[model samples]
Target: AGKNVNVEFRKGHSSAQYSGEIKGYDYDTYTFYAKKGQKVHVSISNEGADTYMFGPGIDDSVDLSRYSPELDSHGQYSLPASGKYELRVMQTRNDARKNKTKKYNVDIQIK
Candidate 1:
């Protein structure tokens, strides 16, 4: 099983940051809750990793193919429902096959 990233911000904070390293087919996954119509943003910085997202209303599925091409995708979205959301990150297969250790810093913001 992959690692689960839990976002934490008590008061006076609106964003959360996570940094991790993953090699080969391993990845980091996050679970959080969002309200309907809430604006959410996710971004990452890494040399060899890409992001996949799944949510209560969005039909986009997680990237299940370990050998798939990496797109380095990230952006903001307006949530369609109030429920749990999942986001994942994995090193690209190109670098994965080489068994390189990929480090990433991911930032998430909600409003």
Candidate 2:
């Protein structure tokens, strides 16, 4: 009883014009807004890098591990409605080797 959400990184992000952790803080983090009693479908994905590691919740503390593929957490979920939802993609081991650096891109889709 869930839906599929699509996520992607916006193009033209660079170091000079952006202020961020490493690559470019200019990277845009998107927020999915929902109204009261509205159902929102969500999905996450990494582009050219490993999977996105994020904490999900009404705030920013929602643990990503809570959404596991085997348990169907990878799919969609119902939003309580009329709230701000935040999802973040930071560099993780999945991005590359233990000491390797790579550009990370992730997108979340809600329909």
Candidate 3:
């Protein structure tokens, strides 16, 4: 929680692909810059991983899936500030405590 993993989109590109493995609390967060009115697209795939985002005007991180009864594999957020945002992909405590590694993929898009 003390560091941010910078998200970089290549020149002429609007998206980036990332992957990781976690056994619990070692979850990494992705940070990116966005302007007010811009939108972010996130696609998280695989097992034992879920994601959330919060920044700028938000008081805390919010689980995008909470908007829907089921945890959607995808989400899009309309940003309202010229600021940075963080993406957290987490594995639950029991899952972490088991010390089993889970693999995941996260695709980030900005438009």
Candidate whose TM-score is highest: 3
State candidate 1's TM-score: 0.77
State the local distance difference test value for candidate 1.
0.72
What would the per-residue lDDT of candidate 3 be over residues 1-111, giving only the tens digit for each residue? Answer: 323579999999999998887665777789988898776777777646767777897677666533433233455677767898988877778877876666888888888
Model 3 RMSD, rounded to 1 decimal: 3.4
lDDT of 1 by residue, 1-106 (tens): 4599777766787788888888788888877887898766766777367777687777766442223333223445667799988878887787778877878888
Off by over 4 Å in 1: 62-75
Misplaced by over 4 Å in model 2 are 1-28, 36-60, 63-74, 93-100
- Between candidates 1 and 2, the one scoring higher on TM-score is 1
Ranking by lDDT: 3, 1, 2
lDDT of 2 by residue, 1-111 (tens): 111232332554211111123232222344444455443333333332222222233443433322544223445444544655544434444433344333433334343
Best by lDDT: 3
Per-prediction TM-score, please? 0.77, 0.40, 0.80
Clashing pairs in 3: none
